[PDB]
Amino acid sequence: AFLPSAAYLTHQQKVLQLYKRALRHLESRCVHRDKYRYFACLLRARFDEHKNEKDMVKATQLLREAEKEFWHGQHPQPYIFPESPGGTSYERYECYKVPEWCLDDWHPSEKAMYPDYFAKREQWKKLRRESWEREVKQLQEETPVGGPRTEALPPARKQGDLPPLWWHIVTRPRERP
Amino acid sequence: DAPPLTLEGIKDRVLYVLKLYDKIDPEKLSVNSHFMKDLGLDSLDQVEIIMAMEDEFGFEIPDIDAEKLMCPQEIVDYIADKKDVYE
Amino acid sequence: ITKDMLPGPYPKTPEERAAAAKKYNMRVEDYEPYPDDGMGYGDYPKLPDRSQQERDPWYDWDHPDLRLNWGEPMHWDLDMYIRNRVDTSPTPVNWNLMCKHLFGFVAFMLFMFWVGETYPTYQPVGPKQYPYNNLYLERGGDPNKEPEPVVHYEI
Amino acid sequence: AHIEPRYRQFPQLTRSQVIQAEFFSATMWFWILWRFWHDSDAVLGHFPYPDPSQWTDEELGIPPD
Amino acid sequence: SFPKYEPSRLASLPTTLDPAEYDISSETRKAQAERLAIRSRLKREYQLQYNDPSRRGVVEDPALIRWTCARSANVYPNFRPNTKTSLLGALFGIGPLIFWYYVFKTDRDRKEKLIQEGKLDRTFNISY
Amino acid sequence: RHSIFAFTHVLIPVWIIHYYLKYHVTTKPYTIVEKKPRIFPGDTILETGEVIPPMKEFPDQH
Amino acid sequence: SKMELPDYKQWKIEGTPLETVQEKLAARGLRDPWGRNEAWRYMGGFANNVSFVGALLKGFKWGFAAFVVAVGAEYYLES
Amino acid sequence: MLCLGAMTTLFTAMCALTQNDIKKIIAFSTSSQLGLMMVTIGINQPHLAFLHICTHAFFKAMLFMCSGSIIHSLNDEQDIRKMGGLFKAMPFTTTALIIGSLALTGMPFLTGFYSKDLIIESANTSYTNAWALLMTLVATSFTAIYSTRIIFFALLGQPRFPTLI
Amino acid sequence: MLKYIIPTMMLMPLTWLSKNSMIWINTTLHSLLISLTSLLLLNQFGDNSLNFSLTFFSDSLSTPLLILTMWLLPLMLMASQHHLSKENLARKKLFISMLILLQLFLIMTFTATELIFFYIMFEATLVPTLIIITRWGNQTERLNAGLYFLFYTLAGSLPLLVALIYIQNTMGSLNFLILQYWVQPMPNSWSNTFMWLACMMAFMVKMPLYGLHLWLPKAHVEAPIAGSMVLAAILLKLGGYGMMRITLLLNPITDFMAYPFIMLSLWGMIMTSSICLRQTDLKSLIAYSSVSHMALVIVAILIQTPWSYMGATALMIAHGLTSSMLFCLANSNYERVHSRTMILARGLQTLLPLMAAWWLLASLTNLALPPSINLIGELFVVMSTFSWSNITIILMGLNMVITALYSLYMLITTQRGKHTHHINNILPSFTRENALMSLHMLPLLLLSLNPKIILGPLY
Amino acid sequence: SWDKDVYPEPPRRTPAPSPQTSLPNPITYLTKAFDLLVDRPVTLVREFIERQHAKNKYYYYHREFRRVPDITECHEKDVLCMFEAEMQWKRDYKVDQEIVNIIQERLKACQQREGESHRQNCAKELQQFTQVVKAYQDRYHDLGAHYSARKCLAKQKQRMLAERKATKEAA
Amino acid sequence: GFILALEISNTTHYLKFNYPSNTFKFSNLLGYYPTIMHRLTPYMNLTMSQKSASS
Amino acid sequence: GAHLARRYLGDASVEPEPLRMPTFPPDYGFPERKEREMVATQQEMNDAQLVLQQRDYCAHYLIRFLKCKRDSFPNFLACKHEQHDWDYCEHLDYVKRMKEFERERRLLQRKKRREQREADMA
C-alpha cells in the first residue's frame, strides 16, 4: 500500500493489521468489557484456526474473505482515540505548535527576559551548524548511486557526530504546548 | 489535572500490564524480555500487548510502529517519544 | 523554475511521454495524462481522483494537513480534495443504498404529512364562540357600517 | 489538599461533593412530591371530561321523530 | 452471503477489498520499489534543504509551481476547438443566459401587465 | 475602593444613560413610546381621580 | 514525584463476570489471558453499581423524609 | 411549520439513539427540542414555544456542562463507550445529569414539565396534522430513550475509561 | 476644484525636489494633507449640486469617490515603498509621479461638468496605469496584461467618443447641468440601439461586465501593489460613475436595452464568485471577487431605481476600501513568501495574530457583514432588484452564500490550519503594514456610523 | 420638546397603585433609590449646564424658501427658470418624504401605545397613513433614479388623461 | 420510552453478538444525510466552479 | 378520538364537519332557547387590553384574575382562586362546545333516520 521504508505489505503484516482492526471494531460493537473479552477470545480462536496454513494462495484467499467479513461486520462509528486521526481531540493543539525559528524573530527586549534560555539556545544553533556539513558528507558517502532506495536514514557512524537530518525531529514542538 | 509521565512511571505501568497477562510469568519478566525470543509469545500476542498498551495509556500506536515494538523497553521509549517525557 | 519543467502540450511520441513522466517525477507505467479532447490539460497527469483524507494519516508527510509530499505531482483538483472539502473515502453503507434510503425516507415522510393534512385530527367540539358580532369592532371592522348580528345561544 | 490521582481503583472523594449531590437529589424529590401533593391536576387532569353520550336529548333539543 | 461493496465516485473501493492489492508478482514489487525509490529521492532532496541551517526562506516546490502553471497558464495553449468543447461552451455559456432572460422577461411582462390593469396590490409600495 | 466595580461599570453608566434618555431622547417625539397601562374595573386614575366603574354582578357558577 | 502502583496480584477475577467469561470459554476449550487486566473494573469501589431505577431514586429517601416533615408542618401550622 | 418541526424532531431524535459521542447526542437532543418548538409554533402557540425556549435553556446548558465535566475528568474523552461507573465517582455531575435528563424528558413539576407537557396538551387538542402529532409523540418517547442512554452508558455500570484515574 | 488640482500638481515639485531619504515621507505627509482637505467637498445640498465653475462641479456621487481617490494616494505610497526600496532614485520618483499624475487625472475625471472632458480625463487615466503595470509589475505577463487593459478600454471607448460628439452636435452641449434640463426621450430604433451601446460599452468594460472582464485578472494580478489598489478601488468605479452620468441621456430605451446585460451580470456574479472557490492565485481570487461585486453595481445602475443608485454608490465606496485592503494583505504575504499561491503559506494566525485579525475583518467586510457599508450597498441593491423582479433574490441569495464561502475559505487557507514547515522567513508584521491595514479598515468601519455621506445624489 | 399636535399623544391614564398583598414590591424601593442616587445628580448637572447655556443665549433659524414659478409656467428648454422650478420641486419632494416619515412615526407609536387593541384603536392613524401613501404614490412613484419635475409632470398628465378618459367613458 | 430503552440497555449486557441492521446504520450514519450531501453538493459545485466556469 | 374513526373509516355524512357547523338552525328542537350573556363590557375588556382570543364569553373572570395578579405583586401564588374560576368557566365553555358537537351529531343521525324512513316508506 503506502509505507515509508517498506515497499509493500507482507501477508503477515496484513494479517496482523486485520486482526487489530477486527478487535477494535469488535470492541466498538461489544461495549462492555467482559462481553468484549469473551468475543475477543472467540475471534482469537478464529484467527488461530487457520494459523498453520503453509499454502500461500489458500492463506491469501482466507485473508481476502476475512477482509470481506470485516467490511460487512464493522461498526459505522467505531471508537477512535481522541488524539488519533478522526478523534475529537486530533490535531487540536497544532495552532499552539509555534516553530522554533520564530524565536529568531523576537525583539531583544523580549529575548532579554529569558537570558539563560537563549544563551542555551545559541549553543544548540552552533552545534547544528557545525554538525550540518559532517552529516551532509555522511549522507553522500553512504547513499547508493541512483539515490536512496528507502526513506530510512542512517545513524551517526562516528563518535561526536550527530545523526543526519536531525534538527526537525529533535526540535519539533511538544504535543501539549 | 493531567499528571506527567516519567520513564519510571511508564516502565512500571508497562510491566504492570504485562504482569496481568497470563502468558507472561512475572519473575522471568524484565524490561529487555523479548516477546518472541525470550517470552516465546506469538505475533498475535504482540498485537494484543500493543493494544493493551493503547488501552492503558489512552493513545493509538500506528501499526508500522507497533510491529517493531518487540521488548518492553522499546514500548516505554516509544511512549517517552510520543509523550515527550523528561522535559 | 525553467520551461521544460513546466507543463507542456499533450505527449504523443513515447519519448515525450517518458520525458513528461520524468518531469512530473513519476513512473512511465503510472503516468496517464488527461485524454486529448482539447480541454486544456496538456501533459498534465490524470492522478487517480481520490481525496486527501484517504491517505495514510500516520505517514510522515511533508505537508501534514494536506497529507502531501514535496515534489509529488499534485492532483488537478487538489484544492478540491483538501480535507476541508470533498472526501471520496469509502462508506460502510453503499452509495446507491444510502441514496435510496434517504430518498425513500424523505418521500415517505412528505407523503404522510400530505396524508395527515388531507385527514386532520381535531376535537369533538363546536367552533369557538366570540361575543359582539364575532368581535366585529375588535378585528378592525369599521363602526360607520353595521355587520350582520351573530347570535350565540346557551346549551 | 487536592485530590491525588489513583491507579486502577476508585478515586478519592470529598465530603462536600457528596453532601451537595445528596442535598440536591433530596431537593428534587422533595419538590416533585410537594408539587404533586399540592397541584395533583397538572399530571392527572384538572376538570372531568364528560361523556357526551350520557347527555339527554331534551337538553340538546332533539325532538323524537 | 455478503453484499459486495460497490465503489462509487464519491466513495471509492477500500484498500482491504481490492484484488490488485493481493498481487504477489515480481513486476508489482518492481513498480512498488521504483515508486519507493522516486519518493525517497524526492524526500531526500526535500529534507536536505529543509534541515539546512543556511537556507532561510521558501523551499520552492516545482510540483506546486507546476500545478499552478497548469491550472492557470497552460489552459489556452492546449485548447483545441472541436465538437465537445463547442457544445459544452455553448451549453454552459449561453444556455443559462437564455434561461434567465426568458424567466425574468416573462415575470416582468406578467408584472407590468398586472400593474397597468390595476390588478397587482401596489398599495403601500412607495419604496423602489 | 472595594466596590469600584459597582461605581465605574454600573453607577456612572446609569448616570450617563439616564442623562441621555432624560434630556436628549425623551425631548424628541416618539423616541420612547410606552404601551399605555392596563386599566381594570375598580381602578382610580392618578391624573384625574376618575374611578373606573366595576363590572356587572356575576351569574355565579360555583 | 513518584506514584506508587499497587500490588498486581490482588486483581483476581474470582467474584467478577470475568469468571463467568472464563467458564464459558472453558465450556468450549478456550482460555482468557487478559482477565486480570480487566479485573479492576469489576472490583473495589466500582463493585456494586446501582441500576437505573436506583439511579433515578437517588435522594428519594431524604427527599421523602423532608416531604413528610413539611406536610406535617403545614398540617399543624394551619391549626 | 408544523410539518417541518415534526420532521426535524423525529429525525434528529431518531439519529440520537445510536450515537456514541456524548456531545453529538446532546446536540441531536437540542435540535429535537428545537423541532418541538417549531411544532408548538405550528399549532399557533407562540408563547408556549417561547416558554419552552426559556425552559430549555437551563437544563440543556446544564447537560452540556455536566458532559464537559465528564469529558475533562476523563482526559478529553467524549465517547460514551469509554465511560461507566460514574454514579459514585462523580456524584455532583451524576446528580445534575440525572436532574437534567428528567427535566428534558418531562418529569412532573421539574422545569421541562411546565412547557413541554403543556405543548403536548395543545398538540393533541388542536386541529392538527395528525402525522405530525404522531411523529411528535414518537420523538417524545425517543427523548426518554436517548436520556437513559446517556445515564446508562455514562453513569451506570462498570468503568471503561483507562487506568490512571 | 482648483483647490485640489493645484496641490496635486504641486506634489510633482514636492517629489522631484526632495532629498533622497525624504521622497516618501514628504509625499505621504502632503497627500494626507490633501486628503484632509478633501472633506470640504461635503458641502452638498438636498436640491443642488456643488457647482464650482463652468468646468468643475461635484454632487454627492462624485464626492465620496473624490475623498476615496485623495485618500488612496498616501495608502499607495505606504504600500509601494517597501518593494521599491532597492529601486533607482529617478525611477522611484517617476513611479511616485505616475501615481500623482493618475490622481490628478482622476480628481478631474470625477468633477468634469462636461462629458468630453470626462472622456479625455477618463482615457488619460490609461497612461499612468499602463506605465505602472508594464514597468513596475513583477512577472513576465505584465506586458500582455497591459495590452489587454489598454485594448479592451480603447475598443470600448472610441465608440463612446463618437457618441459623445454626436450628443454634442444634436443637443448643442455636453454639460451635465444643461443635459439635466434638455434631455429628450430616446425612442426605440436601431440608431438609438447602437447609440445606447456606444454610450454604455466603455463603462461596461471599466466595471467590468462579465464576458468583458478578461482584462482584469491579468491587469490586477500583473501589477504592483499601488496599481492593484488604484485599479480595484478607483478605476473600476469610473465605469459606475460614467453609467450614472450617462443613463440620464438614454431613457426610455435603457428600460429594454438593459435586459441582456442584467443577465450577464446576474449570472456573472454567480459564475465569478464560484470561480473564487477554485482559485489558486490569491490575487486572482481578489480580482474575480471584484468582478463579482461590480456585477451588482452594473445591475443596480441598469434597473435605475433610487434604492439601486444609493446601494450602488455605497457598494462602490465599500468595495474600494475592502478590495484595496485585500490586495494589501495579499501583498503582505507576497513580500514574505514571494509567491501568490494561496495554498503555499498556511496557518499564518499561528505566526501573525494581529495581521490575522486584519484578514478576519477584511473577510467579514468582504462577505457583507452588517452594519458595514458593504452590507448597506449589498442589501439596498438586493431590495431594488427584488422590486425589479421577485425571482432575482434567488440569484442574489445564492451569491450571498458563495460570497461568504470564498471569503472564509480565503481566511481558512491563508490563516488557519497547520503552518507550512519549510517556510521560515515569515517575519513579524512591520508597523507600516498594520498602519496600512488600519488606514483601510478604520475609515470603512467609521462610515457605518454615518453612511449618508456615501449614499449618493438621491439620499 | 416638540409640537404636541403634529406628534399627538392621548392622555395618559395610569391607575392608582392599589396593593392587595402584604409583601412590599421592590419597585418602589428601586424607584426611590433611582430618584435619590440617579435622578437628582443628573438633574443637578443638567441645571448647571442649562445655567451655562442661559449665560450666553443665541439663536438659529428655520430657512424659508419663497415659492418660485413651478415647471408648468417655465418655457421649454429655458434653464434659468426651470432650474429654479427643479430646485423647488426637489425641496418639495424631500419635504413630502419627511411628511410620510411623520405619519409612519404616528402609526408605529399608536401601535405600540395601544398594545393589544391596536387594530381597533388605531383606525384613524391607519386611514391617514393610507391616504398619505396613496398621495405619495400618485405623486412620486415609478419616476426613476433620474427623476425630475418634468418626469413628475409627465406622470401627472398621464394620470389626468386616464382620469379624464375614465370619467368621459362613464358618462 | 424509558421502559423500552431499559430493555435496550439490558440487552447490551448479554453475551450475544449481532450484526448491524439497516435501521441501525441509518441512525448511526446520521440518516445518510451528511454523507451524501456533503460529498455530492460540493462536487457538482466545485467541478462546475473549475471545469465549467474557470477553465 | 373514536370520532376520527367514525368520520374517516366510517361514514362521513353523519359526522359533523368542524369547519362548517352548525348546519342546522339554533331553534330547530328548541322552544325559546336563550342567548349567551356577556358580562364584561366591551370598553372594559378594551381597557383591560385582552388578547382577541381571550375576549370570549368568560373574559370577566380573566379581568378579575389579571387585576388580582397586578395588585398582589410580588406574591405570584396569591391568585389561585381567580385562576381556577377562569379555568372552570373556560371548561364550561368547552363543555358547551362539546354539547354543540353532540347536538350536530345527533341531528345528522336524525337526518339519516329520516331519509331511511322516507326511502323505506316511498
Ligand SMILES: CCCCCCCCCCCCCCCCCC(=O)OC[C@H](COP(=O)([O-])OC[C@H](O)COP(=O)([O-])OC[C@H](COC(=O)CCCCCCCCCCCCCCCCC)OC(=O)CCCCCCCCCCCCCCCCC)OC(=O)CCCCCCCCCCCCCCCCC
Ligand atoms: C466617531 C467615534 C467612534 C468611536 C468608536 C469606534 C467605532 C468603531 C471603530 C472601529 C472599532 C474596532 C477597531 C479595532 C479592530 C481592528 C484592530 C484589532 O483587531 O485590534 C485588536 C486589539 C485587541 O487585540 P489584541 O489581543 O491586542 O491583539 C489582536 C489579536 O492578535 C487578534 O485579534 P482578535 O481576533 O482576538 O480580535 C478581533 C476581534 C474579532 O471579532 C470579530 O471579527 C467579530 C466582529 C463581528 C461580530 C460582532 C459585531 C457585529 C456588529 C455589531 C456591532 C456594531 C453595532 C452595535 C450597535 C447595536 C446594534 C445596531 O474584533 C474585535 O475585538 C473588535 C470588536 C469590534 C468589531 C467591529 C465589527 C467588525 C466586523 C466587520 C464589520 C461589521 C460591521 C461594522 C460596523 C461598525 C460600526 C461602528 O484592539 C486594539 O488594540 C484596539 C486599537 C484601537 C482601536 C481604535 C478604534 C477606533 C479608530 C478610529 C479613529 C478615528 C476616530 C476616533 C475614535 C477613536 C475611538 C477610540
Ligand SMILES: CCCCCCCCCCCCCCCCCC(=O)OC[C@H](COP(=O)([O-])OCC[N+](C)(C)C)OC(=O)CCCCCCCCCCCCCCCCC
Ligand atoms: C468592448 C468592445 C466592443 C465595443 C462596443 C461598442 C458599442 C457597440 C456598437 C458600436 C457602433 C459604433 C458606434 C455607434 C455610435 C452611434 C452614434 C449615432 O449617432 O448613432 C445613430 C446613427 C444614426 O445615424 P444619424 O443619427 O446620423 O441619422 C439621422 C437620424 N435618422 C436615423 C432618423 C435618419 O447611427 C449610425 O449612423 C450607425 C450606428 C451603428 C454603426 C455601426 C458601425 C460599427 C460596427 C460595430 C463596431 C463595434 C466596436 C468595434 C471594436 C470591437 C473590438 C475591436
Ligand SMILES: CCCCCCCCCCCCCCCCCC(=O)OC[C@H](COP(=O)(O)OCCN)OC(=O)CCCCCCCCCCCCCCCCC
Ligand atoms: C422550509 C424549507 C426548508 C428547505 C431545506 C433544504 C434547503 C437546502 C437544500 C440542501 C442544500 C444545503 C446542503 C448541501 C450543501 C452542504 C455543504 C456542506 O455543508 O458541506 C460540508 C462539507 C464537509 O462536511 P463533512 O464531510 O461532514 O465534514 C466533517 C469531515 N470533513 O464541506 C465541504 O465539502 C466544503 C464545501 C465548500 C464549497 C461548497 C459548495 C456547495 C455550495 C452549495 C450552495 C447551495 C445554495 C442553495 C441555495 C438555496 C436557495 C433557496
Ligand SMILES: *C(=O)CCCCCCCCCCCCC
Ligand atoms: C381520537 O382518538 C381523538 C384523539 C386525538 C387523535 C388520536 C391521538 C392518538 C395519540 C395520543 C394518545 C396516545 C396514548 C398513548
